[PDB]
Amino acid sequence: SGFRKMAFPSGKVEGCMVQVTCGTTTLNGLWLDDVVYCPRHVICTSEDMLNPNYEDLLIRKSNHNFLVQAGNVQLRVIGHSMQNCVLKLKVDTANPKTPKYKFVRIQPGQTFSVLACYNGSPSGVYQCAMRPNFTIKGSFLNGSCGSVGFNIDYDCVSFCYMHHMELPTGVHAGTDLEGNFYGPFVDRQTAQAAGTDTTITVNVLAWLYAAVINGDRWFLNRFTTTLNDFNLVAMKYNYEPLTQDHVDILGPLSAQTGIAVLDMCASLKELLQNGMNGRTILGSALLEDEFTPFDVVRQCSG
Amino acid sequence: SGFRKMAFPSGKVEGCMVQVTCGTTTLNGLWLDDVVYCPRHVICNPNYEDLLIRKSNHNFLVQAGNVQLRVIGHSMQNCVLKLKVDTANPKTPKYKFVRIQPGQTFSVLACYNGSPSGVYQCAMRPNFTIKGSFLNGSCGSVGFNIDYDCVSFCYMHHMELPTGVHAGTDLEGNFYGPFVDRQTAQAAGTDTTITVNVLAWLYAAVINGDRWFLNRFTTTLNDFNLVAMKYNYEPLTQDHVDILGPLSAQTGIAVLDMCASLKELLQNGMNGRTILGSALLEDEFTPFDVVRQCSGVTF
Ligand SMILES: C[C@@H]1CCN(S(=O)(=O)N2Cc3ccc(Cl)cc3[C@H](C(=O)Nc3cncc4ccccc34)C2)C1
Ligand SMILES: C[C@@H]1CCN(S(=O)(=O)N2Cc3ccc(Cl)cc3[C@H](C(=O)Nc3cncc4ccccc34)C2)C1
Ligand SMILES: [Cl-]
Secondary structure (H helix, E strand, O other): OOOOOOEOOOHHHHOOEEEEEEOOEEEEEEEEOOEEEEEHHHHOOOOHHHOOOHHHHHHOOOHHHEEEEEOOEEEOEEEEEEEOOEEEEEEOOOOOOOOEEEEOOOOOOOEEEEEEEEOOEEEEEEEEEOOOOOOEOOOOOOOOOOOEEEEOOOOEEEEEEEEEEEOOOOOEEEEOOOOOEOOOOOOOOOOOOOOOOOEOHHHHHHHHHHHHHOOOOOOOOOOOOOHHHHHHHHHOOOEOOOOHHHHHHOHHHHHHHOOOHHHHHHHHHHHHHHOOOOOOEOOEOOOOOOOOHHHHHHHHOO | OOOOOOEOOOHHHHOOEEEEEEOOEEEEEEEEOOEEEEEHHHOOOOOHHHHHHOOOHHHEEEEEOOEEEOEEEEEEEOOEEEEEEOOOOOOOOEEEEOOOOOOOEEEEEEEEOOEEEEEEEEEOOOOOOEOOOOOOOOOOOEEEEEEOOEEEEEEEEEEEOOOOOEEEEOOOOOEOOOOOOOOOOOOOOOOOEOHHHHHHHHHHHHHOOOOOOOOOOOOOHHHHHHHHHHOOEOOOOHHHHHHOHHHHHHHOOOHHHHHHHHHHHHHHOOOOOOEOOEOOOOOOOOHHHHHHHOOOOOO
């Protein structure tokens, strides 16, 4: 029993965190085999950030301009290349602690663990989600750039996020491990702002199924709804549209609890209308959207 | 910016998790140097001295990854079984066994069959239970804090109570709370809110740019405690006020000034507003957790 926002054990990722320094800038790198991956803005000054020409700034650098530190050991840089918004530093030592891994690009609504680091040293681990507006509501300070997001289903670490920047509203933007940004963001200090955020509907529904599994049914009603009527209502509360794919994905939880997806949708419709009236659901007074259908099955069942 | 329920990096603890089997019961063990620590109920009104005397070393099957550790001795300390093994754990970190007080927080590495599955942050409730997330097979999972490079082990999971909350011991086998390790009628006492922790989280909200709850008012410590007793909040002591000093100086809001804001939130609610994305007053961040997360302390 119990339901917690649970992160993956961070050990496999801790053994990859290094510090990368170029001139006055110091940030985090991910050391996998003989390559260190880090945000390409490590080659920029604060001035450069307005309109940086990364190809021009990079061509002026040599291998010895990049200082890479793994614990108390300096790694030697023997090559460098840029792939989108990530700098790849070839080093002379393969990481002996390299876990089994994959680089995966996630979609909005997907969750992952973040190992927040400063000066190549891990300070904490937390669970979060890729928001529909492609930002993440993280907890990051100056120097956290290069911290990574991941999942560890089985013994394979799937790296899905690398931290690059903090937006004006305090939310965060970054790339997959191939350097492609999530969202319409650029690694440039420009007037860019997060789009209006919405609630991840399929995730709230999954969390309502988690409450049922844990013994809570107070929010259920005798009603059902069509998918289209549900979407017309949910859109008015800034909820993401629920697609047929979402309904399919919720099938296992629907079968385990005996509550049809569209009957759970009717309960969500009523919660949006009435609020909770002094009650909580799994210890929360708000509708939680940072647990996917997959996370619910993983935690409530094993 | 941002404020998350953050756990310590679990790596130093992952390298210590093993699977312990005795007969039909399988649970988790903590392998430090040449000893494996685990709940004594793995041998299971039980007379533990009588159940233990009937066991030999080879009755305990200890597995570290894909390797079997041979048990060469066994002894009991309170509600923890200590299994002497032939091999010292080469991944043993620098560590201490510490007993925590209610209100203190820690990270839990939840394991099943000696394999870590997740990490989460939680607090020792004033009623000595923890609101964790555990299933059958989670027994022996541990709670810890990291200070510098030293892992301070403070909790070992033993059981779930009827309300879905959890009970366990420190690493010396002494239970937190009036609980015993057996199938008997047990229940968590009436819980209270950790006041010093809510105040710390209110200081964290001010640091992150949320000030709607601040007011021009102050209060005496005694008047605040009279209001706190009415709302099932733990009494705030002068020690709590001292501990909140750094956060008070960083934000320019006196502790009793922040107490007056808390008094108003308890008496009137949040009125459709949230604080750090929460419609409830959060009490599982200590003053030290707030300073550490708003400063970036690394391990
Ligand atoms: C919120 C401030 C406002 C201006 N900057 S900054 O620190 O000068 N800045 C600009 C900038 C622009 C583009 C890119 Cl790709 C990176 C960056 C850097 C950045 O975003 N780094 C940070 C990443 N995460 C949390 C941060 C928290 C507090 C500071 C900085 C953080 C540096 C951010
Ligand atoms: C809540 C159930 C009700 C009955 N039992 S049990 O599973 O039969 N049971 C008896 C028992 C008695 C004394 C001690 Cl010290 C430990 C235990 C065990 C226990 O508490 N283990 C669990 C620990 N955490 C989460 C668990 C989740 C689901 C099952 C079990 C869990 C097993 C607990
Ligand atoms: Cl995805």
